[PDB]
A paper describes a structure:
The transpeptidase LtdMt2 catalyzes the formation of the (3–3) cross-links characteristic of the peptidoglycan layer in the Mycobacterium tuberculosis cell wall. Combining the structures of the two fragments provides a view of the complete three-domain extramembrane part of LdtMt2 and shows that the protein extends at least 80–100 Å from the plasma membrane into the peptidoglycan layer and thus defines the maximal distance at which cross-links are formed by this enzyme. LdtMt2 (Rv2518c) has been reported to be expressed at the highest level and has been found to be essential for virulence.
The crystal asymmetric unit contains two molecules with a monomer–monomer interface of approximately 800 Å2, suggesting crystal-packing contacts rather than dimer formation. The Na+ ion is located at the C-­terminus of a surface helix and is coordinated by the carbonyl O atoms of residues 342 and 345 and by three water molecules. The core of the transpeptidase domain consists of a β-­sandwich formed by two β-sheets packed together. The large hydrophobic residues of the lid (Tyr298, Tyr308 and Tyr318) and the residues surrounding the entrance to the active site (Tyr330, Phe334 and Trp340) contribute to the closure and to the exclusion of solvent, which may support efficient catalysis. The three tryptophan residues (Trp394, Trp398 and Trp401) in this segment form extensive stacking interactions at the domain interface and are likely to stabilize the relative orientation of the two domains.
Residue numbers in the entry: 148 to 408
Write the structure that this text describes.
Amino acid sequence: MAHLTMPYVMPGDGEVVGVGEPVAIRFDENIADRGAAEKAIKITTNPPVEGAFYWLNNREVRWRPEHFWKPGTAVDVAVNTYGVDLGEGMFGEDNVQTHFTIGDEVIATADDNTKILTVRVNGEVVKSMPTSMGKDSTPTANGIYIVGSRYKHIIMDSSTYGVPVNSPNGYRTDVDWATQISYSGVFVHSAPWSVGAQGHTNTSHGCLNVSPSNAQWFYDHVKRGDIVEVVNTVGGTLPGIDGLGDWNIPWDQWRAGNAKA
Ligand code: NA
């Protein structure tokens, strides 16, 4: 009996995504030969751009260029793992493909010195939103965050992130208009309870609190792969292997890869 593993490729076939979206290939088993996996994945872009592979964990590899994508780029991915030994006799269960395109450049910068989140679309300021980020004891990390999933309404529960709800930094919070920007649990979301503090004082556990209307706007206009950059906070840097932290790894290190470690 064969040992098989199924690949899953993102983003979605035909999706339009932002300039920060990486190609993601996740397998349902640990990959013992990361080099075989990389060799089996073919990527074509138009206009052509150099890119490289980097593993976030034993099951998931990412591919991106050095710089954010050029708007209008079309990308084809073929994960040709059928017939490929991905290490220790674990074979690809199937081949998978995605074709996607890059939309407008959307980069929203949150500067702790001004407490404003400024959304720029192809270089042009379209919104200036007062924000309240993580208070000093639970700060928002600096760095480049890739926009992920969005929810009209959800609960953020700190136990998802290893912090008990009953503990001083714990929370179990209903939020409207929530756009996820890290797997570590940073979201841009509606925070009617911090509208006074927004633009002046950090009060959150690390999320970018903005007004109800600004969060709904963000929910409506920003898409997976668009960019939030956080600067000047008292936090550290979002980890490169967060899940949405890919761009915080310097290109030389990204390009060198981690196929053999
Ligand atoms: Na305010």
